[PDB]
């Protein structure tokens, strides 16, 4: 396995920051990835051998460390927006051999300007018209998450306590709704006969991460807790 | 006893409503009052017996029919948004003569001007700084609800899946943060010892009565379908 700490993380610019990827595959090679909304996966840093490290094609402003043969650390010493990214670690072969490379689960770090910034979503939940399209439905329910920042959630779909997977139409990526605010819909789609039935349960679910357990929250407001949000409705007769 | 129906109403200027109250205590007199935030509980119209209706002091704009001992109902012809307010039933004894009537749960009724003004809620938890003040705490946790329209809510806590009623301190009344907007808050205290569990789940519901089922939303957008809004987070080590 790799593995990677912290999963999500913010930051606020000139602050320092370390990502940590840790593997049990006993592998020689480690790398430090980016992936950016529209470019690509690009390497940051690299390293061969416990001790040892190399620049990859994005270097600047990035330092690594390899302490042992199954720690890889990505070290920021002074956090710039445009650090704000989805880093990916991985072990294995060689240098763009990703058929011999196992990757680590990814960490969202998004570099503020201030950490009053964070705010939490307000989640809702509509009944889509087919009178407004020629073609069929919309989905039965749609989930509307808005007004968050940074994009560091994760939304599911609960009928009558258990989670879904199917008939589910999430949007791929937050959609930048203003300056400081995202936007996230999905749709949901069971029988209009499930649906009508008043006994049945639907939740939507919104997992936020904002602040960190070390993260110091400035004086002067109440500091934001929230980290799930849920929006529910029960079914409507038939 | 004595119930109401609907428990919750909103009406577009101009609509038709009716209030019904049914009680089971085989009671002559029956009534129907409003409660004003400010004002007093006043007496719109009663009853003396199955059949018959009298005026009481404020009857203007609405009308009320006792078709049997059993149901007493209040009935607005053309609603007007000064209509907007707490309906209580109640039975019993004379006129004024408090101690002999048993009074119905109350039906909250919000005539406005376009049912697209109905908006739930925003919920959110926050912690709230000790630094602040000279004095102690300022509750564990806080919960705010805002940005809802109209004020149709009913906020409740919960602490590892248990609804909890020590502790808490809800605002008495949503405060119109706006125009077409309303905010509450409530605080939850417990022992910091069992904040710091990480074990613990704490969650503040927000239930909002919008549309009900014989309301139809006007085409254009989807329908505001949610009931029920939960905030919840994990308690931080100690």
Same mark, same amino acid.
């Given at each position: 396995?790799?593995?990677?700490? @912290? ?51 994005? @270097? ?43 990757? =680590? ?7 503020? /300007? ?39 959630? /994760? ?21 930048? /709704? ?31 991460? =904002? ?20 929006? /529910?409705?029960? =079914?409507?007769?038939?």
């Amino acid at each position: 396995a790799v593995t990677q700490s @912290p999963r999500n993380k913010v930051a606020v610019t000139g602050g320092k920051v370390t990502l940590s990827c840790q593997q049990t595959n006993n592998h020689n090679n480690m790398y430090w990835y980016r992936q950016d909304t529209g470019h690509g996966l690009r390497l940051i840093h690299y390293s061969y051998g416990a001790g040892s490290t190399e620049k990859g094609d994005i @270097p600047d402003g990035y330092k690594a460390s390899r302490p042992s043969q199954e720690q890889f650390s990505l070290i920021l010493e002074l956090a710039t927006p445009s650090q704000t990214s989805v880093y990916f670690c991985a072990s294995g072969g060689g240098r763009g051999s990703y058929a011999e490379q196992f990757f =680590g689960p990814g960490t969202r770090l998004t570099v503020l /300007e201030d950490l009053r910034q964070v705010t939490p979503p307000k989640v809702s939940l509509f009944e889509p018209s087919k009178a407004e399209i020629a073609n069929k439905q919309k989905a039965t329910l749609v989930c509307l998450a808005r007004g968050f920042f940074p994009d560091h959630v /994760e939304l599911s779909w609960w009928v009558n306590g258990k989670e879904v997977h199917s008939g589910v139409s999430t949007d791929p990526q937050a959609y930048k /709704e203003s300056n400081y605010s995202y936007c996230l819909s999905s749709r949901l789609r069971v029988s209009a006969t499930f649906w009508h039935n008043p006994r049945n349960h639907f939740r939507c679910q919104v997992q936020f991460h =904002g602040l960190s357990e070390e993260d110091k929250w400035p004086e002067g407001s109440p500091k934001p807790v929230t980290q799930n949000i849920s929006a /529910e409705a029960w =079914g409507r007769a038939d």
